[PDB]
Every structure is written in structure tokens, then in C-alpha cells.
Amino acid sequence: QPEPDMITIFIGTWNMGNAPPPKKITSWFLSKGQGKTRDDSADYIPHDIYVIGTQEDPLSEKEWLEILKHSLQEITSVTFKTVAIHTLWNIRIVVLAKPEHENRISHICTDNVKTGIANTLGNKGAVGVSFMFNGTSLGFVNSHLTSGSEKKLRRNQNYMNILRFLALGDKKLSPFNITHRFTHLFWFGDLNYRVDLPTWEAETIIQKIKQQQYADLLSHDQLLTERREQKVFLHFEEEEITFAPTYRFERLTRDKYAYTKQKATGMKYNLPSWCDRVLWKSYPLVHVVCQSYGSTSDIMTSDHSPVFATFEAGVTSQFVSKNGPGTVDSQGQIEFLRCYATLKTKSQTKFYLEFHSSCLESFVKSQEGENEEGSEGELVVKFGETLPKLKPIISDPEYLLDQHILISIKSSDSDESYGEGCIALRLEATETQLPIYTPLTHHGELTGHFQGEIKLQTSQ
Ligand SMILES: Cc1cc(N(C)[C@H]2C[C@@H](O)C2)nc(C)n1
Ligand SMILES: Cc1cc(N(C)[C@H]2C[C@@H](O)C2)nc(C)n1
């Protein structure tokens, strides 16, 4: 039985509005409704992994697991295995996988982050799951961010607290947050970003939605505009939105948006908005293709509609050679020429690099770089030809070209990372000097860049 080089992943997000679901929710898992929908000819084909995020979920874990597993069994005739389930208040994540994957999945991790302080600590935050699927690390985050049209900055703050403090994936990757720990990271939820148009334009917005004319609405979507200004979700992707706003509906129909201010809303308007979203970030030059992104039309218990997204995701096998794991493979090496970091810091300490990768027996510290001043004020840290030669555990190009090197630039004075990035070994050539580049981030904000050349030797 061959190991897969691709899997498909279902991501669902649904703010259930504290109400039990209706008796049939299969349209969600089938990616049917509005937007980019799944072909009918695939309806009996199970996805490999289903990841379900709920918010305002009134059900017990047991109650929701029974509904999810029975739904999938009805669709696919497969009894899925529960990989993980984690709940913070009424925010929940469930991971289900086909039984054939049970012995491909390991290192399962769950965590949560509570956002806000005093007043604002008590119902918002995130839950997440990570695991290995054969040689590939997968992370999943379900967040319920701060509500309200005039709180986009709070949402952005909630995002940074979540990516700083959610403790998923390999703890040995200590300089790295969740935005660097996984081959594929999916972040979804009721992100709560709104269409920022004047309240007086509510009926105009509704008209546009009825005409399926979303362009003048999406140009005011706060998540797209905050992302375009690099205020949130730097380096994450989102499929184009081609479905109507998923909030705020009258319950038991989808014929009406309920936008007007009410005591129950704190006297706030809820103009129709794309609150419910799926984004991803995958390492450079790994296969990831969104094959559906939409909302259901026939699940009406909540004031939100469920959102679905599906992905093809490249995966790798758990590689064993005669040499590594358990030793190095002398026919392999990774070399670095003409390398330098450009940092935005106003500080003057020495810096060194750390290289982390599951192709190395353990992480590698460089010598300190040489600081110079950039012609536009920057700190440039020069490594020239001084970086260590990295010794991979396996030299076989079918393994090594699929790997990635995480880079942290660290202060000599404090050993704190000032920037983190990732370099793919999926090169155009081996034994050839080739340009490399990554942006550097810290707490998910841009802090600099790392560029230079690489020379990769494999056994071929
Ligand atoms: C908790 C945890 C650990 C982990 N490790 C150690 C990987 C096994 C592979 O050899 C590196 N990976 C993930 C995704 N999570
Ligand atoms: C090259 C590139 C561009 C980009 N853009 C323009 C986002 C659309 C959102 O409005 C800003 N996002 C990413 C992740 N990469």
C-alpha cells in the first residue's frame, strides 16, 4: 500500500449562535451552496482529514462528535477516527481522519489561547490542533476574535496574541511561533472582520448582495484591507470570496439580513459581513491548492452560515535510509554563500543565526555576523562565506529537495530572536550556487530579510 504524496483536507467554520444544529448538515461537508463549490461527482469521495471549527457551540463534545461522525458516515460510508477535540468555552475544534490514516498520524498536540484582559477576557480566543502526517507537519487554528465593526485593531491584537501564545507543534523549534512550525497551517474561525461602509448604506449593501455583486463590498472588507496594509495575517493566503456575507441572518431563513441595532446587540449595527473565514500558510514550494471555498445555503439555525474550504495538500513519507535517521549521510551537505540579514531594529548588538530542520540531527548555531549600516538607515548583518556547512541525516534527493530550513537571527546579548523565516530546498539545481530569500518576522510582524546563495549536494 503506497504512502500518499497528496491528501485532501476539509476545513469548516461555523458560529452556531448558541443553537443546536438542524437534523441534516451534510451540505457543509459536501461543499455545496454559494461560492466555489465541490463537483457533484466527488460527493461519495471522503476527504482524508476533516477539521471542524465552531464558535458559540452549545453542544457537549460528545453531542457534536456524534453528529459529525454520523454525518460523515452517511456521506461517505466511512467511520472516521477522532484525531483530536479541544474546547475553550464555546470555541471548539474537531479533527477527524479516515481510519487508514490512524498509523500515519502522530505527535498530536492541542492548545488554546484566551484573548483580552478583565472586561475583555471571558469568551474570545482560539483553540488549535497539530500533528504529523507521515513526514508533513499540519497545524489548525480556530479563533473567535473580538466582535464589532469599530474593533478591527482589537481583532488584529487578538491575532498576534494567538500566534504568540498558542503552543502547538515541535517545542524544540523554540524561536518559532505557529506561523513557522508547520508545513501547512490553516487558520479559520469567526474572525469577525466587517464590511466597513456607513450604517445608512445597509439597504444598498443588501441590494448588492441580492444581485451577487460583491466587488464594492469586498473592497471595504476589513480583513482584506488590514491584510493589504500588513496589519494582520502577513504571509497568509485566502481564496477569492464568491459567496454572500455569512453574517448576520435572521434565523430559520436565509432570506433576511438582520443588521439594525437592538438591545441584544448592545445597540450596534451588524451590516452584512464576511465574519467567517479560512486562511492558510504553507512553506515555500509545497503543493497547496484550494478546491472549494463557500457557504451553505440550507443550514439556518444560526445567525451565521457555515463556511467550508477544501484543499489539496502535498505530503511526504517517513524516510529511512541505511544512514539517517540516527546518523548523518556524508554524501549530503547544505552550504551558504554571500548571505546577509537586513534588520529593521534600531538596536546595536551582535547577531548569530540558528538553522532548524528535521533534516538535521539538531539545530545549528552560526558564528556572529559583521554589522554594517545600510544606505537607507538599516542594520545589515553580513555572514559572507562564514555560515556552517549543514549535514543532513539523509542525502537522497527524493528526501532532501522536499525539506525546509527555518532560520532565526538571534541577539548575542539576549539570545532573543529578532526574526524568523524559512528557506525551501526545492532547488532548480544541485551542486550549483542559487539565490535564496526569506522575509523575517517576529511575533508575525515584518522585522527584516535574509538573502544569499545556497549550494545543495545530494547523493545524485
Ligand atoms: C509536538 C510535535 C512534535 C513534532 N516532532 C518532534 C516532529 C516529529 C518529527 O520527527 C519532528 N512535530 C510536531 C508537529 N509536533
Ligand atoms: C503577494 C501577496 C499579495 C497579497 N495581497 C495583495 C493580499 C490581498 C489582501 O487584500 C492583501 N497577499 C499575499 C499573502 N501575498
* HSE-CB of 117 using CA atoms within 13 angstroms: 3
Cα gap 185→279, rounded to integer Å: 8
Q: Quick check: CB of 132 below 6 Å from ligand 1?
A: yes
Backbone torsion region of residue 212, taken as left when φ is above 0, otherwise alpha when ψ lies between -120 and 50, otherwise beta: left
Q: Quick check: CB of 128 below 6 Å from ligand 1?
A: no
Burial of 62 (0-12, 13-18, 19+ CB in 10 A): exposed
Closest alpha carbon to 303 in 248, 242, 221, 351: 248
Q: Is 312 strand, coil or helix? A: strand
- Cell for 65? 462528535
Burial of 265 (0-12, 13-18, 19+ CB in 10 A): middle
Q: In what order do the strands lie in the sheet with 417-424?
A: 364-368, 351-356, 404-411, 417-424, 434-442, 445-457, 333-343, 379-384, 370-373
Please tell me the distance between residue 228's alpha carbon and the centre of ligand 2 in angstroms.
6
Q: Quick check: CB of 130 below 6 Å from ligand 1?
A: yes
Q: Quick check: CB of 224 below 6 Å from ligand 2?
A: yes
Q: Quick check: CB of 235 below 6 Å from ligand 2?
A: yes
Please tell me the distance between residue 130's alpha carbon and the centre of ligand 1 in angstroms.
9
Ligand 1 atom showing the smallest separation from residue 169 Cα: 15
Q: Are 294 and 242 in contact (CB under 8 A)?
A: yes
Please tell me the distance between residue 227's alpha carbon and the centre of ligand 2 in angstroms.
7
Closest residue CA from atom 5 of ligand 2:
228
Please tell me the distance between residue 224's alpha carbon and the centre of ligand 2 in angstroms.
8
Q: Quick check: CB of 281 below 6 Å from ligand 2?
A: no
Cα gap 341→320, rounded to integer Å: 34
Instruction: Tell whether omega for the bond before 325 is within 30 degrees of 0, i.e. cis.
Output: yes
Sign of dihedral through CA atoms 318, 324, 328, 331? negative
Ligand 1 atom showing the smallest separation from residue 137 Cα: 14
Q: Quick check: CB of 403 below 6 Å from ligand 1?
A: no
Ligand number, closest to the Cα atom of 234? 2
For a substitution probing ligand 1, which of 136, 138, 170 has the most ligand atoms within 8 Å of its CB? 170
Cα gap 202→197, rounded to integer Å: 8
Q: Quick check: CB of 240 below 6 Å from ligand 2?
A: no
Phi and psi dihedrals of 121, rounded to 5?
Answer: -90, 125
H or E, element range at 293: strand 288-295
Q: Quick check: CB of 170 below 6 Å from ligand 1?
A: yes
Q: Quick check: CB of 146 below 6 Å from ligand 1?
A: no
Residues ≥6 apart with Cβ < 8 Å to 456:
333, 334, 335, 400, 401, 425, 427, 430, 431
Q: Is 147 strand, coil or helix? A: coil
DSSP 2-49: PPPSEEEEEEEEEE-TTS---S--HHHHTT-SEEE---GGGTTSPPSE
Ligand number, closest to the Cα atom of 106? 1
Ligand number, closest to the Cα atom of 231? 2
For a substitution probing ligand 2, which of 224, 228, 280 has the most ligand atoms within 8 Å of its CB? 228
Q: Is 365 strand, coil or helix? A: strand
Cα gap 100→434, rounded to integer Å: 40
Ligand 2 atom showing the smallest separation from residue 234 Cα: 14
Within 10 angstroms of residue 413's Cβ, the number of other Cβ atoms is 11
Please tell me the distance between residue 231's alpha carbon and the centre of ligand 2 in angstroms.
12
Q: In what order do the strands lie in the sheet with 307-314?
A: 34-36, 288-295, 307-314, 6-15, 49-55, 91-97, 81-88
Q: Quick check: CB of 38 below 6 Å from ligand 2?
A: no
Within 10 angstroms of residue 109's Cβ, the number of other Cβ atoms is 19
Q: Quick check: CB of 229 below 6 Å from ligand 2?
A: no
Sign of dihedral through CA atoms 230, 232, 238, 242? negative
